[PDB]
Amino acid sequence: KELKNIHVCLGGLFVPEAYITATRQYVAQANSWSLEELCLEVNVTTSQGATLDACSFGVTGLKLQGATCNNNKLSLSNAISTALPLTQLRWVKQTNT
């Protein structure tokens, strides 16, 4: 149960794509959905000031190249890279809209 609420650094994992697949599989099993009909949406918030629901997984260490994220909206910047404090990966059903 605690492994869901730990924020991982995708750069520090040997196989981050396996982590993404594992989180997708967790969300699908928990909600009795199908794996192929799940899409990913990203919400960048502050590490301390964040809430993880049953479908959201926190990820740290993601660096944004050539842009800044304020209020989950992107703007171009002259900085080489901008650090994203905490990236929340929420798995939701595909809408096809």
Partner: protein
């Protein structure tokens, strides 16, 4: 030099003329010329055979002039025949795809057309055979491989056109014409089928059945193209109501009819036609939907122009020009080549991009180069585009043997025929060959460009290009395509001038979701979209989540194998439901059957039957969770193969193997066998991957036997070690001069299966590759293991793989294969857990209880022993626990379970033989059950100790003994400190110490430190017994240990107790190949053709041959981690034979065994042996004798030595102590870390004793100080001569003085340690010490005499020169005495060697090396030296410089010569006969009357050993010395290294 050539020319010309009886009708004048030539040949036959003497026939006049005239005539007629063949190939250019002999066969067999049927497959895309009447005089039509046929509108009459070329050309032309007319009729009918609101299914199926699978799809595409063009023309007014919706609705209703057709049962051809039409109409529907969405209202809009559009104009008279294919601005005319029934590719957004790019390349008159990763549709998309335009597409699998000439011939054929050439794996060519081929490609493309100009007219000169110094007509239909897998291993880089001749296209991400949706839809799967949307993300998630293994592949080759299996499973389930309805009821409604069918269950079954077998143990739960999530609720239960399980039960019973079901013992292995059976069912290319000793070989052998007994089809297996032979011998060679193709091993096997002379096509043929896989040899099998199922050779030949042949690889890892090989084969993963240790124990006990050891009281002894050993060979038993503990100790080699188990089993067989010998020696009182029980239990403990810790040092053996004592209940020795490893088992059944077998001996004074003398030591008596046990079973074995440990002494001491075994010394170096073993076989063995096959046995009857390999782990590993010679030996040990590459014949070994020796694989230059090779060879670790053992061995030698002078009798113990102490300090101080040659072993301790003995032998008496002086002199000569730095020499000298005064306190220091310790037999008769000044004067006088008779170069004498000449003179006075002088050039090494050789009466031989010097010259010089030294008894100082080494072959030959004293392969042929004659006269002169060749060669070897002295001089390079320590290992353990260095 003329008779052989003329004879050969006449022989093959006579064969050609006689075999082709109809060649005379069309080659009249040269037929008469050859008739006259044959009359002359008959006259020669009747003249020369009358007198069978060379002198009787060279004296006859008119023979040489007539021979030259015949040679000229033969050359002229051969040229005429070649020019005729070229001219006949100019007409009907399709003959460029058949061989010269095949073309001649076609020429000679024009009367009988039955023989012509086997050549139409390679001269046409889909014409398998022609259709003929009963008269075989008129050509009615042609047929495809699937049986589909087209009937000619006007049949071609052979009688009216007797010549082969004319009627073949007419057959091709009529093929094209009849296909055009059939297309016109089919288009007329499908046009009626178009523009209709509803379609009658019966009429549509009738039309589908009427026409060929090619033409129905072509007509559908046409009709749709004119429909969309007309609809867009209607909308061209602007704002018009769309009739494109009508076209879409027509497509949808026709697709509904086709989809309803595939549910119900259809003939296979009509099913394939329906599948092709479904794919095509799905593409058409998608295109029409895109056009509707984009609101296209113009026919000139690029959204319509970019598509492939067909425009049919039957009114035009020309056959090629009725139909025109257009894509963007590229226009093509349909080739109307009969393509048979091909498999169609879902046209996806990437086959549409590929079509566009490749057609743009074609319109630009330059080739196309689709590139990307593996399994992306590159070859198949090129082939599909070629079939779309009706072109003849030839696929070539390129490799490094596709040189300039082979590619030139291929280009000539493509140019003349007018075909497309798909050169797959093209970057597998050499970079220089790619650069050379770019010129031909550029010339062809320039010819195409000049053809394309409007100024050119077909009535003008034909368009030609210069290919291979000839003008070749270039057809405008030619295309060149190359598919490359960039960045892959084994691939080259294309030159930049070659890349501009091709239009590249990255094909990296195939649209897998569409291919699966369309593939399932065309197979009758209702809800195919859902299944595709589940199965493609499933494969993506399997790729992402599962662990990274070298044999894993989840690409389009896996989807395509899963989808095909899904279709097959659905068909099988429908048939099963029909049978069940027949059993219960009668109503068989196919609509209801298709409606209520578990399609997700079928897909899961296919996934489990294709993807599960390859998964490792920790990945199976992940894939099953992925299946349960992607396909929730759907579950599949594997169907039991009850009949196959029973048949496998019988096979395992007769093969002493363990069978199990599910969770029973052996259940996993049987499951793996069933998985292999299924993957065999679905794949024609196979891999059994898994660690060594996991059950793969037994799995496929048991499967083959069970399939033979279950299906009735005989199973034939051809096991090939691909890396034990060169790729030239594996696939074949093309002669660069005469262009003559010689079949390889695999090529010969496949061609033999295809020919089916002995019914090989009716048997189940499996070609097993039991060896390592690398992208060099396995990628030649890319076109074989693909969907082309074809082996293409550089000489243009193509061999289709028959449907009954399976290509199987049995490997232990795939870490060097690229993803191009992994993606094309169905994997089965055999973990070591599949074969449990209990199963191996059961197999051993069953074989012991069934197979007698002698060839029955022996079987009764075996059964009793097996009954006794049964309790210990159980799971969680003594053997299992001991093996588990043994894996925690450290061994000199990587421990494997089966090496230990094989050693233990052979040792137990030797125990049974010991009991049999005891019974034979006590006929009155045979061994009873109690004595047998005690002996067998104690011997089991002893064998476990020696098989599980034999290759480990003393501490690890003691640890294993202690653990066994802790865990076992067998009686054990009660000694408190002595380990169990120090005990043996007497036949009475009691532990007896090995020390009772170690007696303190007294060596004879003349046998002191002799090569054949072994002082008995505990380790010697133990290792001799172990080696006797392993050799008596003829088991291969390896002795491992430091150099000088005593491995060869132990082996030769153990072989002395075996009188029927003769050892042959083989010295491996880094350049060793199987050729050395083959030369040894040629010299010491002979091939005889037994009725069971060819058998290689030693020449001497009744004697076993032992091939002793001195350095078995030196041979170089290629860039893919394989030693070819080690693979050869592993093949000879596993399968008991090898393949003779002369005629591709399996040769079975008999009375031949192998023994290897090596330094530990952690030593520099030593490679760890393969786990598959180490499985069969037990390893015994022979370590250096310790100070106590050294004291014992050399104490006996010194005691034997000091008996020469009785006054020195009391000094043996302190002398031996001083020797041992100084040797130990020298070994500790100077290690191989500092310099490569700083290797100190008991060998120096032996040379020390021998040197002191030789310096003491002639003296009548000597004081103690003289003895210490000799001791110190030998210490200096043995420990200081090799030292590089002066600090090392100073340390050695100071510590020599220290040791001498420590162990000999009451001696005169000055009279024994006077620093210039010089000894020489030059001034006196004996080897007494010499003083420096008198020695200098003597050397000065001898140098004056040397100048008078030899080199007149004056020399300056300094003390180092005197030291060096004394050192050289010491070596020149020894048997097999070779020198290695290392120092700067110009230091006097060669001059001093020559001068000392002049004193010692040694002839100086130096090889005269120049620019044109090569291997044969060195071999001839070696033969001259060996003949002079051996046959003529001449003492020769063979001085050789490192600059003379122009090749590694020189060093290999010198390695063998320096070690053995004889080169086995040097004298062969007439040279061997001359050598043997000369050896006969030489032995006669010596006084020995020797008759047999074996004893003459032994005498020759002894003479070469005694007489030839090799002096090797080299510069003191740092890395060069390390390189030579491996290239020529004998240079450092057979030569005496002397570091001259620069002048101080």
């Amino acid at each position: 030099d003329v008779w052989i050539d003329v004879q050969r020319r006449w022989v093959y010309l006579e064969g050609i003329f006689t075999g082709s009886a109809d060649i005379k009708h069309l080659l009249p004048v040269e037929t008469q010329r050859f008739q006259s030539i044959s009359t002359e040949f008959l006259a020669l036959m009747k003249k020369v055979s009358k007198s069978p003497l060379v002198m009787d026939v060279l004296n006859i006049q008119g023979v040489q002039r007539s021979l030259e005239r015949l040679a000229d005539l033969l050359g002229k007629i051969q040229k005429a025949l070649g020019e005729y063949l070229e001219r006949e190939r100019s007409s009907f250019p399709r003959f460029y795809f058949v061989g010269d002999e095949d073309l001649l066969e076609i020429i000679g067999n024009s009367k009988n057309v039955a023989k012509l049927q086997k050549h139409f497959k390679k001269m046409f895309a889909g014409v398998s055979s022609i259709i003929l009447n009963e008269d075989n005089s008129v050509v009615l039509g042609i047929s495809s491989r699937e049986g589909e046929e087209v009937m000619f509108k006007t049949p071609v009459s052979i009688t009216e056109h007797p010549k082969i070329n004319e009627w073949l050309t007419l057959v091709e032309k009529e093929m094209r014409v009849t296909l055009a007319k059939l297309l016109a009729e089919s288009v007329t009918e499908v046009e009626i089928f178009g523009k209709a609101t509803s379609i009658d299914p019966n009429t549509y199926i009738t039309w589908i059945d009427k026409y060929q699978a090619q033409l129905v799809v072509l007509s559908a595409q046409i009709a749709w193209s004119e429909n969309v063009e007309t609809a867009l023309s209607s909308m061209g007014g602007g704002g018009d109501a769309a009739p494109l919706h009508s076209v879409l609705s027509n497509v949808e209703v026709t697709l509904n009819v086709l989809a309803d057709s595939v549910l119900m049962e259809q003939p296979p051809l009509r099913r394939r036609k329906l599948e092709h039409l479904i794919t095509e109409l799905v593409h058409q529907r998608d295109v029409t939907r895109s056009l509707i969405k984009s609101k296209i209202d113009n026919a000139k809009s690029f959204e319509w122009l970019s598509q492939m559009r067909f425009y049919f104009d039957p009114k035009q008279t020309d056959v090629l020009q009725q139909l025109s294919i257009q894509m963007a601005n590229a226009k093509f005319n349909y080739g109307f080549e009969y393509l048979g029934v091909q498999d169609k590719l879902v046209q996806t957004p990437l086959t549409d991009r590929c079509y566009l790019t490749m057609t743009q390349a074609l319109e630009a008159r330059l080739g196309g180069s689709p590139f990307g990763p593996a399994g992306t549709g590159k070859t198949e998309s090129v082939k599909a585009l070629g079939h779309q335009l009706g072109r003849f597409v030839l696929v070539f699998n390129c490799d490094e043997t596709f040189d300039f000439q082979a590619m030139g011939r291929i280009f000539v054929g493509l140019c003349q025929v007018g075909a497309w050439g798909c050169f797959d794996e093209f970057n597998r060519l050499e970079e220089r060959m790619l650069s050379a081929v770019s010129q031909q490609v550029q010339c062809i493309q320039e010819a195409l460009r000049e053809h394309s100009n409007p100024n050119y007219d077909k009535t003008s000169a034909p368009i030609t290009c210069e290919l291979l110094n000839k003008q070749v007509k270039v057809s405008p239909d030619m295309a060149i395509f190359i598919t490359m897998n960039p960045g892959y291993a084994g691939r080259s880089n294309l030159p930049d001038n070659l890349k501009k001749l091709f239009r590249s296209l990255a094909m990296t991400k195939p649209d897998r979701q569409l291919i699966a949706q369309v593939m399932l839809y065309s197979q009758g799967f209702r809800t195919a979209e859902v299944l595709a949307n589940k199965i493609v993300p499933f494969f993506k998630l399997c790729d992402e989540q599962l662990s990274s293994q070298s044999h894993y592949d989840f690409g389009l080759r896996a989807l395509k194998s899963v989808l095909v299996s899904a279709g097959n499973v659905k068909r099988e389930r429908i048939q099963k439901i029909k049978r069940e309805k027949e059993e219960r009821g009668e109503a068989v409604d196919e609509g209801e059957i298709a409606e209520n069918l578990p399609e997700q269950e079928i897909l899961i079954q296919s996934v489990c039957e294709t993807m599960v077998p390859k998964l490792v143990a920790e990945d199976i739960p992940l894939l099953f969770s992925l299946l349960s999530d992607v396909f929730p609720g759907v579950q599949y239960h594997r169907g039991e193969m009850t009949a196959l399980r029973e048949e496998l039960k019988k096979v395992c019973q007769e093969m002493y193997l363990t069978y199990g079901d599910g969770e029973e013992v052996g259940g996993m292995w049987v499951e793996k066998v069933l998985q292999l059976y299924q993957i065999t069912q679905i794949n024609h290319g196979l891999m059994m991957v898994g660690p060594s000793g996991s059950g793969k070989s037994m799995a496929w052998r048991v499967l083959l036997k069970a399939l033979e007994r279950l299906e009735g089809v005989e199973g034939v297996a051809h096991i090939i070690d691909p890396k034990a032979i060169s790729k030239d011998h594996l696939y074949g060679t093309l002669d660069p001069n005469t262009r003559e193709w010689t079949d390889g091993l695999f090529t010969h096997v496949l061609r033999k299966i295809i020919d089916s002379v002995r019914g090989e096509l009716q048997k189940r043929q499996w070609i097993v590759f039991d060896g390592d896989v690398d992208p060099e040899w396995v990628e030649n099998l890319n076109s074989v293991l693909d969907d082309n199922k074809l082996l293409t050779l550089p000489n243009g030949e193509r061999l289709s793989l028959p449907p009954n042949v399976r290509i199987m690889f049995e490997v232990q890892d795939l870490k060097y294969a690229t993803l191009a090989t992994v993606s094309r084969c169905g994997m089965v993963w055999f973990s070591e857990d599949v074969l449990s240790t209990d199963m191996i124990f059961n197999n051993f006990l069953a074989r012991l209880r069934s197979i007698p050891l002698d060839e029955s009281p022996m079987l009764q002894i075996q059964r009793d022993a097996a009954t006794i050993m049964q309790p210990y060979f159980t799971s969680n038993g003594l053997v299992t626990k001991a093996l588990e503990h043994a894996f925690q100790l450290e061994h000199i080699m990587d421990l494997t379970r089966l090496r230990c188990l094989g050693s233990l089993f052979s040792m137990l067989h030797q125990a049974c033989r010991n009991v049999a010998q005891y019974n034979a020696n006590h006929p009155d009182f045979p061994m009873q059950i109690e004595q047998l029980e005690r002996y067998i239990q104690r011997y089991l403990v002893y064998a476990i100790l020696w098989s599980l810790s034999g290759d480990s040092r003393l501490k690890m053996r003691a640890e294993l003994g202690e653990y066994i004592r802790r865990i076992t209940t067998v009686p054990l020795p009660t000694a408190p400190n002595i380990p169990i490893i120090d005990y043996e088992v007497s036949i009475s059944g009691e532990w007896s110490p090995w020390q009772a077998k170690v007696p303190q001996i007294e060596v004879e004074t003349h046998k002191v430190a002799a090569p054949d003398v072994v002082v008995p030591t505990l380790d010697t008596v133990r290792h001799e017994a172990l080696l006797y046990t392993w050799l008596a079973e003829h088991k291969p074995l390896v002795l491992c240990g430091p150099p000088g440990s005593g491995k060869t002494m132990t082996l030769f001491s153990a072989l002395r107790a075996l009188p029927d075994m003769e050892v042959v010394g083989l010295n491996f170096s880094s350049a060793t190949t199987p050729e050395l073993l083959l030369k040894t076989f040629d010299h010491y063995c002979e091939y005889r053709r037994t009725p069971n096959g060819v058998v290689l046995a030693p020449v001497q009857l009744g004697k076993w041959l032992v091939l002793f390999c001195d350095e078995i782990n030196l041979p170089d590993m290629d860039k893919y981690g394989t030693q070819r010679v080690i693979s050869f030996i592993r093949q000879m040990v596993e399968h008991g034979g090898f393949y003779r590459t002369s005629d591709q014949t399996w040769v079975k070994l008999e009375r031949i065994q192998f023994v290897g020796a090596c330094n530990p694989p952690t030593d520099p230059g030593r490679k760890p042996l393969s786990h598959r090779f180490l499985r069969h060879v037990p390893v015994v670790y022979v370590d250096y004798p310790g100070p106590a053992s050294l004291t014992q061995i050399y104490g006996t030698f010194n005691r034997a030595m000091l008996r020469l002078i009785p006054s020195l009798r009391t000094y043996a113990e302190p002398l031996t102590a001083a020797m041992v102490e100084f040797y130990t300090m020298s070994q500790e101080r100077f290690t191989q870390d500092t310099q490569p040659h700083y290797i100190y072993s008991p060998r120096e301790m032996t040379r020390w004793v021998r040197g002191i003995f030789e310096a003491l032998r002639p003296l009548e008496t000597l004081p103690v100080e003289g003895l210490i002086r000799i001791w110190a002199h030998e210490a200096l000569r043995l420990f200081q001569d090799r030292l590089v730095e002066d600090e090392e020499r100073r340390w050695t000298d100071e510590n020599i003085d220290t040791v001498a005064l420590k162990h000999f306190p009451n001696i005169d220091r000055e009279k024994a340690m006077s620093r210039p310790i010089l000894y020489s037999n030059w001034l006196s008769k004996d080897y007494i010490p010499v003083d420096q000044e008198e020695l200098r004067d003597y050397v000065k006088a001898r140098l004056k005499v040397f100048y008078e008779e030899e080199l007149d170069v004056p020399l300056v004498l300094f003390n180092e020169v005197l030291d060096h000449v004394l050192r050289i003179d010491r070596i020149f006075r020894q048997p097999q005495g070779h020198l290695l002088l290392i120092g700067v050039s110009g230091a006097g090494k060669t001059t001093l060697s020559r001068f000392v050789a002049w004193m010692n009466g040694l002839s100086v031989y130096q090889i005269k090396v120049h620019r044109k010097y090569t291997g044969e010259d060195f071999d001839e010089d070696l033969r001259t030296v060996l003949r002079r030294s051996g046959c003529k008894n001449e003492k020769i100082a063979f001085i050789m410089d490192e600059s003379n080494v122009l090749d590694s072959g020189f060093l290999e030959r010198m390695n063998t010569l320096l070690a053995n004293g004889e080169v086995p392969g040097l004298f062969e042929g007439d040279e061997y006969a001359t050598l043997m004659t000369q050896c006969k006269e030489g032995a006669q002169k010596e006084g020995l009357m020797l008759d047999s060749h074996e004893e003459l060669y032994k005498w020759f070897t002894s003479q070469v050993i005694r007489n030839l002295h090799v002096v090797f001089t080299m510069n003191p390079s740092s890395e060069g010395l390390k390189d030579r320590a491996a290239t020529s290992p004998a240079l450092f353990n057979r030569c005496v290294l002397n570091w001259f260095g620069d002048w101080s």
